Nucleic acid binder design. Structure first.
Ligand code: ATP
Ligand code: MG
Length: 437
RNA sequence: GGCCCGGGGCGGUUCGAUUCCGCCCUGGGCCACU
């Protein structure tokens, strides 16, 4: 097991077989014919146009070029009209920039409308750079497409591929830029081992400098950070994965990790061993796009975690899961039950004005003096994390994300114990607690 | 939708709040959906 031989075997996993390629070329030819029959102006971009698409994950991107004077509404209406007329079956679901997704002779297709600008200067639609990325890449990625595939396969197998909010990882484009910059997958991995959270990679200048945060400047637009949505943690996982890989090569790094089935009876025993409070807030999943949902699940989950820490329940970690039916914010605290009494800091004995106001307070236990200042015993309105969250969630629902919050407002429940291990969250909990196997 | 920076109004908590928990108005960037 040496890098050399391993990467040789890995190609079998990332390179599309001749049949899959034929399927794409055949689908390409059909798109062309449907589009030419409409006399539409288009251009093939992305993975398929450059032959850097990962085996099994083929998607053809067709970009409909529109004059700059056109309305964003005209693009949407016209582009959606063209997309629907050109796909066997289609689906329209997006967060902001419109596009049609569908199928042609068996392969996934994305028909997207954009403005045909000159200079990726001041983009008008969110996707106007894409055509220029193609221009900039077609002449430089030639001969190294399999190197790109190795990188994509590597990141995909380890859950950090996509740049969408569900993953906060490396986009396909970023991968190609990295390949152009380092020359190959091995080189990229070798150098990535020394990346820092301040690393700046400028491919157009062929330079690596120190910066404010992780920044990969787009050759097409120097102000654009291609890795803007790559989370710090995901950057850290990659760098580490790169160290581990070079240290002990294995094509296991290209094989998707074990689905993991682990029985609920085992989870119960682990939680018992841990002596922690493991619970979850359950509510109905809002009918909105992944790209809108996840950031809200992140916020809600975080706002509640902070409530748990300032409330002294010693939160350990939080996680979340979304099924098609419901959503779950998961928590584990070191404190299952806290006392009713606690001490609140008061003024220094020195100024009677404030000491006076501090003592006029109707109180159950009579404040005391300790180290030069007054302190008072106070009673909590709740003593467990669950009682706390039920309280917080019912009252601060509006701060847990627009849609996620509104849903919790109309309904939510706190699941714990055995009734929790039944829900579709065992995987997430095991992951959250670091259960190995 | 989420994040970041900023205006102007407020409610609650607190001995004490610009500073802690939040709500309305609003201006400007950015990110995801290709
Ligand atoms: N998040 C993004 N950041 C930058 N460019 C992007 C992003 N998403 C899409 N693009 C542009 O649109 C093109 C199409 O992206 P798409 O989502 O189809 O993935 P891809 O790049 O085709 O690779 P793959 O299909 O193998 O994931 C990219 O090649 C790039 O030019
Ligand atoms: Mg594609």
């Amino acid at each position: 097991m040496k890098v050399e031989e391993i990467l040789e075997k890995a190609l079998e996993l990332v390179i599309p077989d001749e049949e899959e390629v034929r399927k794409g070329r055949e689908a390409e030819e059909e798109l062309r014919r449907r589009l030419d029959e409409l006399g539409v102006e288009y251009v093939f971009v992305g993975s398929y146009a450059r032959n850097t698409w990962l085996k099994g994950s083929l998607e053809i991107d067709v970009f409909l070029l529109f004059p700059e004077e056109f309305s964003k509404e005209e693009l949407r209406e016209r582009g959606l009209e063209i997309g629907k007329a050109v796909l066997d079956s289609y689906e329209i679901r997006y967060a902001e920039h419109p596009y049609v997704h569908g199928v042609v002779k068996g392969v996934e297709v994305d028909v997207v409308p954009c403005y045909k600008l000159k200079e990726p200067k001041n983009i008008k639609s969110a996707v106007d750079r894409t055509p220029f990325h193609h221009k900039w890449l077609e002449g430089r990625i030639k001969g190294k497409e399999n190197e790109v595939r190795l990188l994509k396969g590597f990141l995909k197998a380890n859950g950090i591929y996509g740049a969408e909010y569900k993953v906060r990882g490396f986009s396909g484009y970023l991968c190609e830029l990295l390949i152009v910059f380092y020359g190959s997958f091995l080189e990229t991995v070798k150098n990535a081992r020394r990346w820092t959270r301040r690393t700046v990679i400028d491919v157009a200048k062929g330079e690596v400098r120190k910066g404010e945060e992780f920044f990969v400047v787009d050759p097409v637009d120097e102000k654009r950070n291609v890795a803007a949505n790559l989370s710090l943690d995901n950057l850290a996982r990659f760098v580490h994965l790169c160290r581990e890989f070079m240290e002990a090569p294995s094509l296991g790094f290209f094989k998707p990790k074990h689905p993991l089935e682990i029985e609920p009876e085992r989870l119960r025993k682990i939680v018992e061993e841990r002596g922690t409070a493991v619970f979850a807030v359950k509510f109905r999943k809002p009918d909105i796009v992944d790209d809108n949902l996840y950031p809200q699940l992140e916020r809600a989950s975080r706002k509640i975690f902070e409530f748990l820490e300032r409330e002294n329940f010693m939160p350990l970690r939080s996680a979340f899961k979304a099924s098609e039916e419901f959503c779950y914010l998961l928590f584990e605290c070191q404190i299952k039950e806290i006392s009713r009494v606690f001490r609140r800091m008061g003024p220094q004995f020195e100024d009677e004005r404030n000491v006076k106001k501090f003592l006029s307070r109707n109180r159950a236990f009579r404040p005391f003096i300790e180290n030069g200042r007054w302190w008072a015993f106070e009673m909590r309105k709740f003593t467990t994390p669950e009682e706390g969250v039920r309280s917080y969630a019912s009252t601060h629902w509006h701060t847990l994300g627009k849609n996620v919050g509104e849903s919790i407002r109309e309904y939510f429940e706190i699941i714990s114990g055995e009734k929790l291990f039944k829900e579709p969250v065992t995987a997430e909990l095991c992951e959250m607690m670091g259960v190995k196997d």
